[PDB]
Structures are given as structure tokens and as C-alpha cells.
Amino acid sequence: RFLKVKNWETEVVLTDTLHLKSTLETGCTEYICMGSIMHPATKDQLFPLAKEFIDQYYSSIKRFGSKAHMERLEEVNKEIDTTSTYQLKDTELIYGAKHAWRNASRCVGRIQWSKLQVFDARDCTTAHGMFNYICNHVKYATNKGNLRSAITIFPQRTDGKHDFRVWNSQLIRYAGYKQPDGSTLGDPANVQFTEICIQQGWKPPRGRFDVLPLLLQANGNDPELFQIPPELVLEVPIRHPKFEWFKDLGLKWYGLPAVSNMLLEIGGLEFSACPFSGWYMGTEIGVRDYCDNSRYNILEEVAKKMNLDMRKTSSLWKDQALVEINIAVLYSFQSDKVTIVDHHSATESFIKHMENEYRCRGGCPADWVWIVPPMSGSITPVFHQEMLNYRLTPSFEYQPDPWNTHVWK
Amino acid sequence: RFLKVKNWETEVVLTDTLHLKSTLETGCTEYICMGSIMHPSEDVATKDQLFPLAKEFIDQYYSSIKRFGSKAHMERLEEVNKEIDTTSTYQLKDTELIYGAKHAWRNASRCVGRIQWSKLQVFDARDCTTAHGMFNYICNHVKYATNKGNLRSAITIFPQRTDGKHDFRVWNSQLIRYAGYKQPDGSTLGDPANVQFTEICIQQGWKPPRGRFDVLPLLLQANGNDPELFQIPPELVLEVPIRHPKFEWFKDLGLKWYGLPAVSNMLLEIGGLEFSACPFSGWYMGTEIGVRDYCDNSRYNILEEVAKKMNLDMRKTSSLWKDQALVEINIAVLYSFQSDKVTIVDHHSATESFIKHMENEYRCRGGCPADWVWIVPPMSGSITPVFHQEMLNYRLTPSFEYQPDPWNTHVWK
Numbered sequence: 075r076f077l078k079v080k081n082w083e084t085e086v087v088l089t090d091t092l093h094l095k096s097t098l099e100t101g102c103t104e105y106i107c108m109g110s111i112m113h114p115a116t117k118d119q120l121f122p123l124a125k126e127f128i129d130q131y132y133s134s135i136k137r138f139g140s141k142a143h144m145e146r147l148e149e150v151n152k153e154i155d156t157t158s159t160y161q162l163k164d165t166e167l168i169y170g171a172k173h174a175w176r177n178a179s180r181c182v183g184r185i186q187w188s189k190l191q192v193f194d195a196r197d198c199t200t201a202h203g204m205f206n207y208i209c210n211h212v213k214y215a216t217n218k219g220n221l222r223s224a225i226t227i228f229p230q231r232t233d234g235k236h237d238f239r240v241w242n243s244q245l246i247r248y249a250g251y252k253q254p255d256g257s258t259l260g261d262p263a264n265v266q267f268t269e270i271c272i273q274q275g276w277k278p279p280r281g282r283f284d285v286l287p288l289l290l291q292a293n294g295n296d297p298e299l300f301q302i303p304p305e306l307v308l309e310v311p312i313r314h315p316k317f318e319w320f321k322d323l324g325l326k327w328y329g330l331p332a333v334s335n336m337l338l339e340i341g342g343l344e345f346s347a348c349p350f351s352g353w354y355m356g357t358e359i360g361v362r363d364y365c366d367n368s369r370y371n372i373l374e375e376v377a378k379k380m381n382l383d384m385r386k387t388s389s390l391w392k393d394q395a396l397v398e399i400n401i402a403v404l405y406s407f408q409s410d411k412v413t414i415v416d417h418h419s420a421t422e423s424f425i426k427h428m429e430n431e432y433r434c435r436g437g438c439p440a441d442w443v444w445i446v447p448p449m450s451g452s453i454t455p456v457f458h459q460e461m462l463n464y465r466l467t468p469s470f471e472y473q474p475d476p477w478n479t480h481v482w483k
Numbered sequence: 484r485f486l487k488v489k490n491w492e493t494e495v496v497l498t499d500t501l502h503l504k505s506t507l508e509t510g511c512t513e514y515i516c517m518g519s520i521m522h523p524s525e526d527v528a529t530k531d532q533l534f535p536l537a538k539e540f541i542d543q544y545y546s547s548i549k550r551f552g553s554k555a556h557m558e559r560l561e562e563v564n565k566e567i568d569t570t571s572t573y574q575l576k577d578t579e580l581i582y583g584a585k586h587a588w589r590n591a592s593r594c595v596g597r598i599q600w601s602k603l604q605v606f607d608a609r610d611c612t613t614a615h616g617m618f619n620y621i622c623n624h625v626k627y628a629t630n631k632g633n634l635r636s637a638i639t640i641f642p643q644r645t646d647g648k649h650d651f652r653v654w655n656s657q658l659i660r661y662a663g664y665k666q667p668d669g670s671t672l673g674d675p676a677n678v679q680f681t682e683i684c685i686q687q688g689w690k691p692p693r694g695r696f697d698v699l700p701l702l703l704q705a706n707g708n709d710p711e712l713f714q715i716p717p718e719l720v721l722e723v724p725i726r727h728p729k730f731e732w733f734k735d736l737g738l739k740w741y742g743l744p745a746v747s748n749m750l751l752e753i754g755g756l757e758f759s760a761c762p763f764s765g766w767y768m769g770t771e772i773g774v775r776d777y778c779d780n781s782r783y784n785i786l787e788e789v790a791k792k793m794n795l796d797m798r799k800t801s802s803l804w805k806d807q808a809l810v811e812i813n814i815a816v817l818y819s820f821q822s823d824k825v826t827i828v829d830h831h832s833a834t835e836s837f838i839k840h841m842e843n844e845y846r847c848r849g850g851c852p853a854d855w856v857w858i859v860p861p862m863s864g865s866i867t868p869v870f871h872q873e874m875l876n877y878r879l880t881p882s883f884e885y886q887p888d889p890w891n892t893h894v895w896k
């Protein structure tokens with residue numbers, strides 16, 4: 075009734091008891107494992123989700139079953155009778171937001187989990203208010219380059235008709251344009267959203283790295299376009315410490331990764347607009363953003379200027395060019411004093427974290443498929459780490475795109 | 484009953500119906516996924532356990548040859564059923580043996596090489612009775628499979644398990660491996676992965692040359708008896724010296740690797756029968772050597788030396804000095820194997836072939852069990868197509884399974 079996991083590089087073994095607290099499906103069964111699938115209330119249903127979280131919280135402050143505690147257990151249960159839902163105390167919102175990050179199985183950055191700055195935006199009511207909260211988030215988090223992790227939490231879902239949503243998948247993305255001759259300008263992953271913003275009245279500059287506008291939806295109304303003041307959008311020009319022609323590539327990338335399309339679930343409530351931001355692992359930019367074939371796809375471009383044998387795959391010209399690109403990302407950010415972590419430091423930090431979590435908490439849900447970096451996998455320590463994956467609450471979940479689901483006016 | 488998988492690089496979606504035939508545990512539950520665990524958690528079948536397993540294997544063999552429900556199919560079932568009832572086991576026809584072996588390979592969810600599953604040379608060694616006999620069967624396998632560098636997939640199959648007390652085992656984990664010697668001071672000579680098995684060999688009288696690339700003796704076990712030592716004849720062990728197309732100094736490293744990878748510690752399960760000794764071999768993907776064998780810290784661990792020779796700034800990690808030297812190593816391995824006309828496949832060619840295979844298998848067979856954590860190569864993962872491919876993992880039989888290390892199990896005399 076316990077589970078061990080081994081590190082085959084170190085032969086260290088850890089015992090998992092924390093898993094005895096999951097409930098949502100993994101999607102796997104004893105007959106099929108779905109570890110690589112990207113995606114596998116009423117009166118009744120809300121009470122116990124709230125109940126278990128309050129017990130969770132009060133257990134986290136020594137005072138489990140305390141004289142206080144039951145008054146909150148009382149008050150929360152009382153409020154659900156009247157408003158149907160209920161509202162978290164500031165204490166609960168901060169705990170719940172920090173623990174959703176703590177339980178994000180796919181996040182390698184979680185050693186930093188309790189150093190989360192929470193911004194309570196639950197008094198927001200209009201897209202204009204949303205824009206204001208988001209601008210203050212970006213400015214705080216960017217912090218001239220000394221980035222700090224933060225989340226802004228907008229009002230919880232109530233009936234579905236009046237959701238608050240950030241339609242951008244991230245606060246800061248570059249735009250994607252369909253070129254008349256079948257090709258794509260900018261970031262290909264963003265063609266659809268970019269066409270919506272254009273359809274919505276955005277006047278695109280139609281270059282590669284055009285920062286998309288914010289498309290914010292408050293209280294179920296139609297979304298509205300807002301352009302983020304550029305003085306808040308910190309960007310880095312990508313140069314190489316060896317190749318002088320590298321600056322000639324015209325490459326830049328922004329400094330603030332901020333996820334804005336996910337759903338945060340605390341005690342049964344559903345915060346559908348909860349943008350959060352950290353700082354980059356270099357491979358996110360170098361390997362995935364620049365080198366996916368469905369993204370900026372610069373491998374051919376870089377190897378050409380490196381003059382590499384591009385005919386046979388066994389020359390490993392893609393591998394060589396990949397390493398160089400990621401050297402330039404990490405070097406460009408460090409030269410411009412913008413926070414960045416390479417995949418070796420990042421993965422070394424996550425082994426520490428797993429060690430911490432097993433000692434003080436008894437388990438750390440982790441998704442090997444996402445924690446292992448997209449490059450040089452086995453030379454990082456997480457590659458040889460067995461992990462158990464299980465779903466703990468509070469949690470970040472996916473949700474449908476608003477445009478697939480929104481009935482306009 | 485109609486599970487979907489998506490490729491996130493191409494948007495292709497495939498429909499899996501084959502999963503309905505799955506069986507033994509994945510190791511996962513609705514509450515915990517174990518897809519990154521390496522393993523799970525007198526033991527021989529009864530007449531009652533065996534009847535169903537055999538029937539279903541026979542039913543599926545006869546379905547494969549478009550003879551399901553035929554009189555041949557019906558007599559075979561009755562022949563098997565009676566044999567299990569009288570002898571508490573049964574013997575596969577040779578045709579069934581070959582189909583079973585090929586389909587355990589087809590079914591092997593961790594194998595990226597499966598596009599070759601049906602071109603497999605099966606050697607029926609079920610008439611073997613002694614360790615000397617095994618040595619001979621293995622020598623023939625090595626020579627056939629090596630083929631002067633034009634490698635050829637093969638398996639040799641020794642007698643099936645009876646009561647567990649009389650098993651055939653190849654105590655080696657692979658038929659060709661380099662010895663590893665721990666030292667007084669904690670350093671290791673050779674291959675640190677093989678320190679234990681080397682010590683066993685030495686205990687059994689093997690006189691070790693104590694070198695960085697010593698081919699281990701074979702340690703063969705017939706019919707539950709004590710294992711016995713045999714030296715593979717060196718002329719049958721094809722090796723490749725590792726050099727680099729650009730760095731003249733790379734040969735000064737003194738690297739070499741053997742050409743033939745051949746797994747000899749697994750168990751082949753066909754129709755409820757267990758062939759505890761079934762060495763099988765193919766050809767290498769370069770990353771197996773150039774990433775895992777040479778660059779794992781618990782292995783030969785040469786990144787340090789190679790970076791040095793490349794004059795790499797190794798002060799910080801964010802120089803990516805390990806990444807940079809790992810690439811030039813794997814370039815050298817591909818270049819060496821190719822230079823000497825020894826069959827090898829790079830990780831990009833191999834993953835592209837496997838996507839092609841996996842699609843054809845959905846189309847023609849209705850699914851293709853795959854283990855993402857093992858299919859993705861341990862370098863440059865996301866620039867290979869398997870990284871963006873959703874995969875369903877389930878156990879199809881016939882199958883290769885892990886089994887305990889024999890030295891942990893065997894009782895001596």
C-alpha cells in the first residue's frame with residue numbers, strides 16, 4: 075500500500091504515500107496506459123469539494139480540526155445554501171493557488187512553488203478592468219528583467235453564461251499570418267487566433283514578431299481588443315557568442331512566459347481566467363518555439379549558415395544546429411540580464427525538489443513525458459528518474475477555446 | 484472501443500481498436516500512471532490456466548493464415564487440448580513457433596525497430612539438452628546474424644519451461660558485452676554497468692584480461708543445471724573502432740564498440756508457454772551507443788574527455804558543453820559503423836520509419852502498442868517525429884517479458 079520509485083543513475087529510491095490522495099481519472103486503466111495522450115456542479119457535488127479543501131488548508135496550518143476550522147466548515151457550508159456557490163478567504167486563495175502549482179505534474183519549475191505572488195482580481199467586472207489587472211501583472215512579473223512568478227485570479231465561473239476568459243493562450247505571443255502562397259509569416263501556431271483578432275479589428279503590422287493584442291472577455295460579454303503598452307513587453311535579441319552571422323538571422327523572443335488559457339480549480343470552484351507567469355527554460359524557446367517544424371522552423375536556415383552536410387540525416391546536422399541555437403538563446407538572455415534557466419540547471423533543480431517533496435510531503439506527482447527536456451534527454455538527471463503521475467487538488471486544468479464555445483451578441 | 488491518438492506535428496488522427504485484445508497489467512490504475520516505471524510487481528501454469536491461453540493463441544494463429552474455423556484449426560485445438568490434459572503442457576508446431584516469435588516482436592511496445600518484425604530468422608533450438616549444446620546454437624546465431632557487417636535479425640529458441648526447476652537461461656543480459664572491473668579505489672575499468680556479472684564470471688573460473696573492452700564469456704544454463712562458461716570465438720565478434728570524420732584526435736580516444744546487439748535475458752511467452760532463453764538480435768540505433776553507452780554517467784562517461792579535446796568552455800552548464808560534445812560523439816559512431824559497412828540506423832531515420840510502421844499498423848491491424856517513454860530517443864527528442872505522436876500502451880500476447888536475474892533465483896550444487 076506504498077509505492078517506490080527508483081533513480082537508475084543514482085540508485086536512490088523514494089517511497090510514495092501522497093498518491094493515496096488522488097481522485098480524478100488519470101485516463102489510464104490496468105489495460106491501457108495513456109501517459110502520452112495530451113488530454114484523456116450541483117448542490118451535492120460542490121459541498122464535498124469545498125469540504126476537503128478547507129480540511130486540506132486547516133491541516134496545513136497545524137490547526138486541523140481546530141475551534142476555528144469548524145466555523146469555516148460551518149460558514150462555507152452555510153453560504154452554499156444561500157448563494158449556491160461560495161467565496162474563498164484571501165488566505166484560502168493564496169494557499170490554493172500556490173498548491174495548484176505544487177501539484178502541476180508537468181511543471182519542472184516547481185521548486186519555486188511557494189514563492190508565488192498572488193493578485194486577487196475577483197472584484198473585476200469589465201474587459202477594461204481585466205486589461206488593468208493584466209498590465210499590472212506583466213509589469214510586476216517582468217521587473218526590469220529580474221523576473222518573479224505571479225498569478226492574477228479573475229472572478230470564478232458561476233453559471234457558464236458569464237465566464238471571464240483570456241482568449242490569448244499566453245499573454246505574450248507573436249502573430250501568425252497566412253501568406254497568399256500557402257506559406258506562413260510569423261508564428262504558425264497562432265494563425266487562427268491572429269485571424270480572429272484581425273477579424274475583430276486588429277490592424278496587423280505583418281512582420282514576424284508582432285506582439286498580439288489582448289482579447290479579454292469579462293462576465294460572458296463579447297471580448298475586446300487591448301494593445302499591451304510596449305514599454306511592458308520585455309524582449310531579447312538572439313545573438314550567438316561565436317557566430318557573428320547569427321545576429322543577422324533577425325531573431326528575437328520575449329522574456330515573460332505567461333499561461334492564460336487554463337482553469338484553476340480550488341475547493342470545487344472554477345477560475346477560468348487565471349493568467350500565471352514564470353520564467354523560461356531555454357529549450358522552450360530554442361528547441362520548441364524556434365525548431366518545431368510547425369513553428370518558426372529555422373533548422374534548415376541555421377545549418378545552411380553553419381554550412382553543414384544537409385543531405386543525409388545520419389550527419390546529425392539538425393542535432394548540431396539545435397545545440398547552437400540553444401546556446402545563443404541562453405547567451406542572449408544572460409547578456410541582457412533577463413532571467414532564464416537552462417535545462418541542466420532546471421532538471422537538477424527538479425531532482426532536489428522531488429527529494430524535498432518526498433521528505434516533507436511524501437510524494438511528488440510528476441509526468442516523465444513532460445518533465446524530460448526536448449533535447450539531450452538522457453544527459454539530464456530526470457531522464458533516469460522514475461516518476462509516478464497522479465492528480466491532486468487544487469490544480470490547473472485545460473478548458474475549451476472560448477471561440478469554439480461562445481455565443482455572441 | 485474506438486480510442487483516438489493524434490500527432491501534434493501533422494494533425495493526423497488514428498483510431499485504435501486493437502487495444503480491445505489487451506491483457507496483463509500495464510501497471511497503471513485510474514488513479515496512478517506508471518508509464519515511466521521500468522518494471523511492475525515454482526510459479527508455473529496449471530492445466531486450467533493453460534487451456535484458455537493456448538486456445539486463444541491457436542485461434543489467433545489460424546485467423547492469421549485465413550483458416551479460422553477450418554478442420555485443420557479444429558483438429559489442432561483438440562490436439563492441444565488433449566496434450567495439455569495428458570502432459571500438463573503442449574508443444575508448438577514449428578510454424579506456430581515462428582509466427583509466435585515474430586508477433587512477440589511486433590507486439591514489443593518499447594521497440595522502435597518494429598518495421599522489420601516480419602523479416603525475422605527463427606532458429607528452433609528446442610532439441611538442445613546441454614550448456615555445450617547451447618553454446619553451439621548461440622555461436623551459429625551470432626555468425627548468421629553478424630553476416631560480415633550486413634546484420635540480420637534473428638532469435639534462437641531453447642526448450643520451454645516445464646516445472647520451473649529445469650529452466651534454460653542465458654545468464655548474460657546481452658550475448659556480447661564488455662567486462663567491468665571495480666578497483667580498490669572505487670574507480671571502474673571497462674563498462675561499469677557489468678561489474679556484478681563480471682564478478683560472477685570471475686568467480687566461475689573466468690580469467691579476466693582486465694581491459695577496457697574485454698568481451699565477456701558466455702554463461703549458459705541448460706535444464707536447471709549449474710551454468711557453465713564458454714568463450715565466444717573472437718573471430719565471430721565483430722567490432723568497430725570509433726573515429727570522427729572531422730576530429731583527427733577522436734581515434735586517439737581509443738574507443739570501440741561491438742557491432743551486434745542481442746538481448747538474452749528476456750522471456751518469450753507464446754500461448755501460455757514460457758521460453759526463458761530466447762536470445763534475439765538486430766542492429767543498433769546509433770544513440771544506444773553514442774548517448775547511453777558512452778555518455779551515461781554510470782557508463783563509459785567520456786563527455787568530459789571529449790569536451791576537453793574540443794576546447795569547450797566547461798565552466799558553466801549554460802555553455803551547453805555536454806550537449807555539444809554529445810552530438811559530435813554520436814556523429815563519430817554513425818560515421819564509423821557506416822565507414823566499415825556495419826549495419827546501423829540513426830535516430831532520425833529510425834523514428835521516421837517507426838511512424839510509417841505505426842500508421843500502416845493502425846490501417847492494416849487496427850493499432851500499434853507503443854511505449855512513448857522508450858520510443859523517443861534519448862537525445863534531440865522533439866526534433867524526431869515520435870515525440871509529437873500520441874501512443875497507446877497495452878500488452879498484447881505473444882510477448883517478450885522481463886524475468887528475474889538467474890543468479891538471484893538458482894539454487895546451486
Ligand code: HEM
Binds near residue numbers: 178183190351415
Ligand atoms: C518559475 C519558472 C518556471 C519554469 C522554469 C517552468 C517550467 C515549465 C515548463 C518548461 C513547462 C513545459 C511547458 C511547455 O512545454 O509548454 C511547464 C509546464 C507547466 N507549468 Fe511551469 N514553470 C515555471 C513556473 C510556473 C508557475 C509560476 C506556474 C503556475 C502558477 C506553473 C505551472 C505550470 C503548468 C500548469 C504547466 C503545465 C502546462 C500544460 O499542461 O500545458 N509553472 N513549466
Ligand code: HEM
Binds near residue numbers: 584
Ligand atoms: C532490427 C533492428 C532493431 C532495432 C533498430 C531495435 C531498436 C530498439 C531500441 C532502440 C530499443 C530500446 C533499447 C534500450 O534503450 O535499451 C529496443 C527495445 C526492444 N526491442 Fe528492438 N530493435 C531491433 C530489433 C529487435 C528484435 C529482433 C526484437 C525481438 C525479436 C526486438 C525486441 C525488443 C524488445 C523486447 C525491446 C524492449 C527491451 C526492454 O524493455 O528492455 N527488437 N529496440
Ligand SMILES: Cc1cc(N)nc(CCc2cc(CCN)cc(F)c2F)c1
Binds near residue numbers: 183244333351354
Ligand atoms: C508559467 C510557465 C513557465 C514556463 N517556463 N513555461 C510555461 C509554458 C509557456 C508557453 C508554452 C507554449 C506552448 C504550449 N504548448 C507557448 C508559449 F508561448 C508559452 F509561453 C509556463
Ligand SMILES: Cc1cc(N)nc(CCc2cc(CCN)cc(F)c2F)c1
Binds near residue numbers: 660745764765
Ligand atoms: C534486439 C535489440 C536491438 C537493439 N537495437 N537494441 C537492443 C537492446 C540491446 C541492449 C540494451 C542494453 C541496456 C539494457 N539495460 C545494453 C546493451 F549492450 C544492448 F545491446 C536489442
Ligand SMILES: Cc1cc(N)nc(CCc2cc(CCN)cc(F)c2F)c1
Binds near residue numbers: 878
Ligand atoms: C505494458 C506491458 C507490456 C508487456 N509486454 N508486459 C506487461 C506486463 C508487466 C510489465 C512488463 C514490462 C517489461 C516488458 N515490457 C514492463 C512493464 F511496464 C510492465 F508493466 C505490460
Ligand SMILES: C[C@H](O)[C@H](O)[C@H]1CNc2nc(N)[nH]c(=O)c2N1
Binds near residue numbers: 457458459518520521
Ligand atoms: C526512469 C525511466 O523510465 C528510464 O530512464 C527509461 C526512460 N526511457 C528509456 N528509453 C529507452 N529507449 N531506453 C531506456 O533505457 C530508457 N530508460
Ligand SMILES: C[C@H](O)[C@H](O)[C@H]1CNc2nc(N)[nH]c(=O)c2N1
Binds near residue numbers: 109112443872873
Ligand atoms: C505526444 C506527446 O505527448 C506531446 O508531444 C508532448 C510530449 N512531451 C512534451 N513535453 C513538454 N514539456 N511540452 C510538450 O508540449 C510536450 N508534448
Ligand SMILES: [Zn+2]
Binds near residue numbers: 106107
Ligand atoms: Zn499510465
